[PDB]
Design a protein around this ligand. Structure first.
Ligand code: HEM
Ligand code: HEM
Ligand SMILES: [O-][O-]
Ligand SMILES: [O-][O-]
Ligand SMILES: [O-][O-]
Ligand SMILES: [O-][O-]
Ligand SMILES: [Co+2]
Ligand SMILES: [Co+2]
Ligand SMILES: [Co+2]
Ligand SMILES: [Co+2]
Ligand code: NA
Ligand code: NA
Ligand code: NA
Ligand code: NA
Ligand code: NA
Ligand code: NA
Ligand code: NA
Ligand code: NA
Lengths: 262, 262, 262, 262
């Protein structure tokens, strides 16, 4: 009988962003000092890029097949995703495919992504507030950039907006690909006549979307579009995995998944 | 090759509430005049009560097993649930269990519940507004009573609240068992100092929760608690399946599920 | 927690043959007096015929869906099939589809058909010998009519032939649809120059194949073809479920399946 | 859309035995010159030994996870097993676990092991005869050593014995772990009073069982036990994959599996 933990993120090949994930690995090791920890990545293109750099970057299926070969029997897979969207659901299907395979893993549990229950959503709103830069002043809006998805779990973003507004009317959620859109965010900012606006990723790592769509020099970045509107945009290139308060939520989900192995 | 449709609701044994579901059956027949329509119910206690009254009330598993015996080969199962919560997810698992069974159904698709994508959520908010009683005046709040759940899909309720507020600041979502709670709703009403408040179910049928928790004579009903606060509460005992605008959304989800059989 | 047994046969709509299955139901009740026993049938055409006669004849899927509705939690499904062929394999898939369904059965085990392990095959050969009519004389061949199948489990028939020959060189296996064929059986009989030959079904019940293909008045029956060869054919219209010795083997498989629920 | 073939054997770490599997790889390449061929092994201990020698030896799960990462979409998995026993069944479950995984393989078919249908069993008996050493004389028995298993598919061995005896009364099947046993084989040889007896593996490769249990210097080997009985034992250390006639059967099963991808 041999327990293991498999941490699974979307992943990033951005050098400057990868430390957020290393930090999570430290937290997990610190919380569970006697349980081996393994990594996988859900984005096929990030795995390609990492392999190109000479770095092992297993898919969840490669990682679980390898852990079965090492003789693990019970594995808690922790999603480092923000919402229970397409990546998370693919992860559940994969995990459950491995469970019970002849001579393989006995039990594979899966920890919820960040915005799990409405209780989690409320905890995330509280944690995001705790994570805000000390230099942000009262009344300066903060826009959290979620990925957005066509999947039904996109509803987690307007859901989170509800909880954030019960803390501070000037905290806003926008997404690259889903709802609310950045145009919705700009309309929110116009009604507030805000002159300085902070932008923080609502992704575990500050990857390509944070560096390019949120804060890029390109004309269509959020920071470029705000500057054209006469707003001083203040992008913060830190993923949510950098925050202890936000990280605690994934850590509790991992505790829950570990308990489900028993 | 033989196509069928299986309509699946939570269900109700309340005589006065069941017509909402009959209405849905009419709409579906009208839209798909050549495809047999069958019914099932996800709540084990409602099936027990209906059987007690001498009424057939198959589980999704009983219904699909019976349709396989009739020689259906491709069945679109339409969820008449509001959110993709525990009932919906149980329905997907069941549907997919039947698909491909030796000598049974070839393909079983499942239509999304009402609050599917963020696009659906936005359409639901628009449809709820279209459904409001003509006697409700501008500025009188309306509280939509969702069921609420411990499942992650509870986030659909604060999500819907976001879309409703982009239409009218005085439209509110509360739930019996999840978030937002009715205490959250009362705090919303207190800030608005509202003197007349409408209450509408955010369930397909106006069942036990609408008749007892929302509008009961008992002390803890929403209407009783509002009356104690000096508010004229105006409960509307109509499920969302009574609305043509709301029903259209489930009908489009059924179209989508039918298309997925091909 | 509620245990049930589901007995599953190919089935028959032949009035005179059905008592063999009733006998099995008695044996099972006698062995497991406190466990409810339910029936299903794997042949879609037999279920059609039985329903036509006004008799309930559930498919395995209908039966299990109904047992879930009665609140059974652990069900041992016993195959009353002779080989682990297509019907048995369809039964396993169905059983396993029901296991773990939300709010349904917790555990569904499946008992092996008659010719399970090589130890079972050897026990079957011994039991068939014990079942022979007292009037059959030493040296008179006995031909056991198996169904035969295109499935790989057809190999159970030549397998059983091996074990039967270690008991008596004049015991022969033939099949309607697989190998050995009846032409192979006739060649076996020609080398033996046998003048009187017994024919016994190697099916649980003496159904259509026993009454028509093995013993029919039609020209192509086994008894007709033997009579044309000058052989006195002595058909015995008793299914193997009539034999206590043969029945014990299915009963042990049911014990094994019951044990697997724990 | 990208087709691949995955050849899966029990495997061997015996240097002298591995060429039989290389031969199969050549045959497959020759038959399907444009389709990439990959290898996996079902025995966990053989994979351990091969890894110890610095050789990649993926499990079926490792191999399929890697092929998904290479962007294969349709993979025909060919079993190089002799019977549809526990290894084969584990292989089917694994193959089917990978099929349809999000962003992974679309279709994974599995080719039957050697003794598939009764038609295959008859073809195997014919192929074994074609494979016999030219020096074996008429009337000298040949004993084929199968592995044997507790699984129901052990019945394939007495089944094959039936077909072999329709070709030559002196061809015998024994197994290490199942039925018929080697003691059964010795009793067959005693009735024949045979003075010279050939021993051939009924495994794809002449691995540990062929080299040690069938032909070892140890007292309990088949060749040692025969020599004690005054029989000249003539072991042939060639696996069945060395035979063109036997190999053709696995090749047809691979054709069938390739066709099932369409
Ligand atoms: C707001 C949260 C969730 C939403 C909105 C949601 C919605 C959906 C939808 C739409 C599907 C159909 C497949 C697709 O549309 O791509 C699905 C399938 C499924 N869900 Fe969820 N789901 C949620 C959470 C969960 C969670 C937390 C679990 C964990 C057990 C789960 C388990 C499954 C499974 C096993 C399937 C089968 C289909 C698939 O993998 O996509 N769902 N869900
Ligand atoms: C001599 C005995 C058996 C033989 C020759 C055999 C052969 C096969 C074959 C050929 C398939 C592929 C599907 C098909 O060809 O129709 C299969 C599938 C399978 N077998 Fe067996 N099998 C045997 C016994 C068993 C037993 C006793 C079990 C009980 C666990 C089992 C479990 C399964 C399962 C779960 C599948 C998946 C595919 C299907 O349902 O047909 N098999 N087997
Ligand atoms: O990456 O969108
Ligand atoms: O019913 O809660
Ligand atoms: O019935 O063949
Ligand atoms: O290896 O037995
Ligand atoms: Co993106
Ligand atoms: Co309720
Ligand atoms: Co037949
Ligand atoms: Co062995
Ligand atoms: Na995000
Ligand atoms: Na990114
Ligand atoms: Na609701
Ligand atoms: Na209700
Ligand atoms: Na039979
Ligand atoms: Na019959
Ligand atoms: Na073998
Ligand atoms: Na070996």
């Amino acid at each position: 009988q041999k327990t293991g933990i498999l941490l699974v993120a979307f992943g990033t090949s951005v050098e400057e962003a990868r430390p957020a994930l290393d930090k999570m690995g430290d937290r997990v090791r610190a919380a569970h000092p006697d349980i081996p920890v393994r990594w996988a990545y859900t984005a096929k293109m990030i795995r390609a890029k990492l392999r190109a750099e000479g770095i092992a970057a297993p898919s969840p299926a490669e990682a679980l097949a390898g852990m079965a070969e090492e003789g693990f029997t019970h594995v808690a897979v922790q999603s480092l995703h923000t919402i229970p969207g397409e990546e998370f659901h693919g992860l559940l299907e994969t995990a459950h495919a491995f469970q019970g395979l002849p001579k393989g893993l006995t039990r594979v549990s899966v920890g919820l992504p960040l915005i799990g229950t409405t209780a989690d959503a409320e905890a995330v709103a509280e944690a995001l507030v705790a994570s805000l830069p000390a230099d942000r002043k009262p009344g300066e809006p903060v826009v959290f950039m979620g990925h957005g998805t066509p999947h039904p779990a996109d509803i987690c973003y307007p859901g989170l907006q509800y909880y954030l507004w019960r803390l501070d009317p000037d905290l806003l959620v926008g997404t690259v690909e889903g709802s609310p859109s950045f145009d919705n965010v700009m309309a929110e900012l116009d009604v507030r006549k805000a002159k300085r606006v902070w932008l923080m990723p609502l992704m575990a790592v500050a990857g390509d979307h944070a560096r390019n769509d949120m804060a890029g020099d390109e004309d269509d970045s959020w920071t470029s579009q705000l500057a054209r509107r006469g707003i001083e945009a203040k992008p913060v290139l830190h993923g949510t995995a950098e925050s202890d308060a936000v990280a605690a939520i994934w850590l509790r989900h991992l505790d829950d998944a570990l308990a489900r192995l028993n």
